[PDB]
Amino acid sequence: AHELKEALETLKETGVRITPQRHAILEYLVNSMAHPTADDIYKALEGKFPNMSVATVYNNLRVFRESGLVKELTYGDASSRFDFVTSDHYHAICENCGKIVDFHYPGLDEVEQLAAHVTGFKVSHHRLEIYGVCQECSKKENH
Amino acid sequence: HELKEALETLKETGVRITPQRHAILEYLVNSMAHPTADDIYKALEGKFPNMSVATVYNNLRVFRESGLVKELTYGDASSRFDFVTSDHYHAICENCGKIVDFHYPGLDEVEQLAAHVTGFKVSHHRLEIYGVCQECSKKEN
Ligand SMILES: [Zn+2]
Ligand SMILES: [Zn+2]
């Protein structure tokens, strides 16, 4: 999975050791249909891993979350589930020259929450494309 | 195609497709500014004798009620006219490939920010929301 590759990329980038246990936890998360609980992951991995406690599952999940790879979804007095995240993108596109500039924007939860309302979709991530005319082509057209 | 599509809009919004209308819409689609009625009058009047600044204005009103132009106001300046490009919002299912359109009332805040940070003059947007549709999500629990 490019997904597993890309998550490991990020771990290594941080100086996070890429241990058998981490590699496994993450691949399980990538392969997951719903977001699993720690207990789900632990039980899927225990056959292959020896030493492995439920504690180390949580400890590694905290490490993925600080690295931005997982979000812990809490349910008051329940077991969290852990969402292996796909990231959102925002691009502005020049209709004249075709240049793309990436920009950051702090989420679009409001939009995601309603689209989920109107469509029925369980939303994972979004790509926003903004069309227009870049500065350098503005000058030439003249604005 | 833009002119084509705007006409399609008029015909359906119930509007006669007079030469002068088609001429102004074509001018609108081909212009990179947001022009004033005098801009548009000066360009076209040479081909239309019965054309007045009024008629330009009156036709812009028509197009604005058809949703094809936005009238931009400022200080004590004469209005400027923006020929609209629709934005689009789609939810795409990662499991079965389905794509569903929905409506959202604009992303003003994002456009104005994008324009600041990238330097772009923004026209419109398309947002794609990836997820899993009702159908596929029931199938998996
Ligand atoms: Zn450009
Ligand atoms: Zn589906």
Q: What experiment produced this structure?
A: X-ray
Specify the residue for token string 């456009």.
Answer: B111
Check the CA dihedral B11-B16-B17-B22 and report its sign.
Answer: negative
3-state secondary structure of A80: coil
Residues B51, B38: contact at Cβ < 8 Å?
no
Tell me if chain A has a CB within 8 Å of the CB of B74.
no
A19 is in an annotated binding site: no
Question: Which residues of chain A make contact with B129, given a CB cutoff of 8 A?
Answer: 111-112, 115, 121, 123, 125-126
Task: Return d(Cα A71, Cα A137) in angstroms, integer.
Answer: 41
Question: Which residues of chain A make contact with B120, given a CB cutoff of 8 A?
Answer: 92, 94, 101, 130, 132-135
A76 contact partners, CB below 8 Å, separation of at least 6: none
Residues B85, B123: contact at Cβ < 8 Å?
yes
Task: Return d(Cα A63, Cα A52) in angstroms, integer.
Answer: 16
Q: Comparing C-alpha atoms, which of A120, A48, A33, A27 is closest to residue A81?
A: A33
DSSP 8-state assignment for residue A121: -
Q: What domains can be seen in chain A, in order of their start residue? A: 1-85 (1.10.10.10), 86-143 (3.30.1490.190)
Backbone torsion region of residue B75, taken as left when φ is above 0, otherwise alpha when ψ lies between -120 and 50, otherwise beta: left
